[PDB]
Design a protein around this nucleic acid. Structure first.
Length: 206
RNA sequence: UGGGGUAUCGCCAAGCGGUAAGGCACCGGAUUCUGAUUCCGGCAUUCCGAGGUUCGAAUCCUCGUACCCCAGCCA
RNA sequence: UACGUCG
RNA sequence: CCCGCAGAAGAAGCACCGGCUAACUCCGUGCCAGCAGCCGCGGUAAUACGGAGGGUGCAAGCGUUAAUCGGAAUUACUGGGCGUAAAGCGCACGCAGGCGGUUUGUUAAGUCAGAUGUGAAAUCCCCGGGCUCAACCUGGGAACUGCAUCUGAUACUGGCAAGCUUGAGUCUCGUAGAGGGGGGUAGAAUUCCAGGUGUAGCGGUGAAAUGCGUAGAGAUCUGGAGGAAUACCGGUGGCGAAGGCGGCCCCCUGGACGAAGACUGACGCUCAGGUGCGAAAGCGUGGGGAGCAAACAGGAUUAGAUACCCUGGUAGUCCACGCCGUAAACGAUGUCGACUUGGAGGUUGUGCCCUUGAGGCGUGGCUUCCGGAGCUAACGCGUUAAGUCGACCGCCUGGGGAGUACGGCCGCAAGGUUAAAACUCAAAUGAAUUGACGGGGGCCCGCACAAGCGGUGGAGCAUGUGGUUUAAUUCGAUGCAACGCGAAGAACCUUACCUGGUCUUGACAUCCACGGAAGUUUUCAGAGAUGAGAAUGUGCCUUCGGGAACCGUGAGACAGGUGCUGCAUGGCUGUCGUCAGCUCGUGUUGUGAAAUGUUGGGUUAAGUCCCGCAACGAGCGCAACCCUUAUCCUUUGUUGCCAGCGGUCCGGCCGGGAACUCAAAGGAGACUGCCAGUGAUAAACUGGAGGAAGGUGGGGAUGACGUCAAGUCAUCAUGGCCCUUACGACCAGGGCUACACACGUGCUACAAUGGCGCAUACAAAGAGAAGCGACCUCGCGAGAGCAAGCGGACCUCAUAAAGUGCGUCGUAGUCCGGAUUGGAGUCUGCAACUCGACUCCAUGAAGUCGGAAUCGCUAGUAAUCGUGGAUCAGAAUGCCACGGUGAAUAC
């Protein structure tokens, strides 16, 4: 087990943080756990909506949750009853007056959360993994994407030993720190157990 | 049955009446991935059992035990 | 295990 | 056989389903039961076992077994092989056998053509015919591949007769040669013997010892004897059928090759049995015996050493005659002949040309190296074939058993030769590829070794582990990469363990139905929760049947599990290793596994970079981008700073100043950029200047493809299995702290480079509200009381300590060392007995520099000195950080 998380080593360099509140030591743990609850809830209740990121920020006793998603229409719905329902329950969880926004992730096959969730969904619909991976690399390289690597792992095809079998195309410069590597990871709970899907997407060199 | 010999650390084997020496083993450490080899340290038998002489017995004397050797013949 | 492919 | 009757009515199994081989899942079993033709399945999710569902193949059959042929070109006549897979006799001579150049004539035996007789019938085959069809029966033909006789043909083969020269042989003349046998001789050297000189070692080895030596060795000189071998020439040189043959000379003798010419005229090639020759060792008889040397003996080495090494040493090696009859007797390649591109040599002839020299042009014989086509599994062979053919011989038929046993023949014997079987395995083998490995080779690196400094192993204690104990001593981690590791902190809690007491839809969920707002202070029993009471209950809506929140009660569906499996998993981690590597696309090469690229010449920290190159490019990695540190500039200047000012309670203390330290943001800076030299004028290297810094400046982060079925199911998630009045839950007490022992990692020591007392100087980095907690008072002290200030460059923790200056101690188990133990306390916490931390008084072990062994470090490093933080109510000698002083050494 030996590679650094390629989001974490780029946190001040190119990648931003998904939480951008300041807090002293008295409420740092409380704000942090409140963020675990709103991302847990808001991740479970938008499983069909293809959600990429949820960014929390707290401007002066009020949360401001931004849902980067690929299907904004299914998040908002017929006149946005679903949004006001979500800020009602996020205001229930965080205990502050909640705002909520939706940012449309166009080009959803270049986002690693959406790619890993895609391949994970296909693996738990019992399709063969080489199609899922290989299709994901092809259609991601089709639109921009100066590199992509996907990597499934663990008891693939229902075996009794676990393999990995990664694929990559293009250039994925993972030790370069100015590389805009969009990396994310999902787990596929199949009837044989968990299958881990990692995906790195190299977008640009700065 | 008689004569001679032996009995001393777990094993083989030195001990001169005032102290128990050697090797193998065993115990601890080290070398080594681990074991053997190796290296460094240790321990250890109040001496077959009983009685006696002596200031003092593994040592000397007597008896018993256990095991060896030699003889047990001429008719 | 284990390699059998589409609008 | 035909017609009528009644009604789908009387009528489907067997094998197989992992691959071969058509046809798949579930359940049971868990290296068992069992299956199987071969490969092989079965040790918990088995398409292979047993059952079921489903399917597949055949069908009044279907499977198994036995037997034959096929596949099997694995006995090869069609139709195989033999350098290395099994297989070329050790080499020749040669009989019987097989084969035989060229021309003409005759024959016509083989060969061919036709005819005749026969080749029984049935059967097979073809065209028809009859049973409703088919099987079956049957008509006619074809066929029976043969044999015999007669008639012809005469190209090939054979017979016969005659020839001919291109095959084979004879003669003439020379050439080279370690060809053979017999005889003689010569020179160096070794050993021995006799003698001279001379004196303390010689010999031997990795080191030694045995051995020889003051009875005079070894060294050295002279004389002698004897035996064997023949330096230099000496050469992938020569000769020989092969084995083999090495001074020089003589005698007897075999073959080869060349030049011109003559002669014979197919006299040739191969060869089973047969015969001969046949290294070395060995055997017999008789000699010889210097060296060397099986056996043997001694010395060593070693765990042992019947060995390698040393010192001796007999058979043997040498000669004569006889035997044996074999070798990796090997070009692992039978003999003879023919044809098929080349190059460089060697050796031995011969012809021609100015031989104008150690030349030029040819033509033979033998031989070496490399290569073309071709062949070959590949490796390689390649006009001396393993190419393209012909003749004859020998041999092979999976590995082992076994070239063995029995029998025969041979042999003095040792043994040789010929040559099986039972049984057993599903491989054995060849060549080549990728890797790994090597006590193989070349180049290169790292505190790897070396050069040093300080440790560990010895002592006491701390902490972890193994073991032992226990009611339990919870579980996990175990070479490196487990062992102050998970645990950044076990009194209760944590806690998972043990002993008891208890609960069962539950401590934690969601959904019901009923009742009641919840909540708040009380008392009794017991270890807590269960029970008994008093107030408060309406927090807002409901054609009232209820809903918001919370608590009891009842059934459940469930909840719960730190239970098992890290060898079913994810995620996260260690490690080789921050080692420089790991690959891919397209192209090409190879039958192919694969190769190339990626290797080679340099260079680099680096598959770094240049150059070359059947490669051209690309990716992950290296480098850079990131953080920090080292210098300067700009901005802002509080709480931070004080150079110049003013006075000053002399303290940045105040007014004030924004220069400086500093703070933090933004820039500059270092890139082999410049110079000289060396280098493929290339990469680069070495040196120099400037500069705070010089060549990835220092440090960190960053850890490629993969390896260890490495670690974790106990952080979490998770497949399957398992418990679900219990393996779940609550509680109190205990344990995780036990202690004959052993190991790991640390701390403190053994002191004078120090101990103690007094004074005194210089830090950095941090933390802080249920917190850090000044000042002041009390206490010897740990601390206590009152209590400012500070959520913080402002206040507090908080005095840095080693250092320095004085005094003392004086080499003592001591004024070292502090363990251990008694007493007295402080704090935290419901609670310090098991089982805290600290203080005071007293006690004052072991220990005087640590055996074998072992570890860390290359410069602000090691060493040494303190300070802070996380976890935490309290508990660090650990961990993570911070600064002070500050080395040695690298050939």
């Amino acid at each position: 087990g030996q590679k650094v998380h390629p989001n974490g080593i780029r946190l001040g360099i190119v990648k931003p943080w998904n939480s951008t509140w300041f807090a002293n030591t008295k409420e740092f743990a409380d704000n942090l756990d409140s963020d675990f609850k709103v991302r847990q809830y808001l991740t479970k209740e938008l499983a069909k909506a293809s959600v990429s990121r949820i960014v929390i920020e707290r401007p002066a006793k009020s949360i401001r949750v931004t849902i980067h998603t690929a299907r904004p229409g299914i998040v908002i719905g017929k006149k946005g009853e679903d949004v006001e329902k979500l800020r009602k329950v996020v205001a229930d969880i965080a205990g502050v007056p909640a705002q909520i926004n939706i940012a449309e992730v166009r080009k959803p096959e270049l986002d690693a959360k959406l790619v890993a969730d895609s391949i994970t969904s296909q693996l738990e619909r019992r399709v063969m993994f080489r199609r899922a991976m290989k299709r994901a690399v092809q259609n991601a390289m089709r639109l921009g994407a100066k590199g992509i690597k996907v990597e499934v792992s663990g008891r693939l095809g229902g075996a009794e030993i676990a393999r990995t079998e990664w694929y990559r195309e293009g250039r994925v410069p993972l030790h370069t720190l100015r590389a805009d590597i969009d990396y994310n990871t999902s787990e596929a709970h199949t009837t044989y157990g968990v299958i881990g899907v990692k995906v790195w997407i190299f977008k640009g060199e700065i």
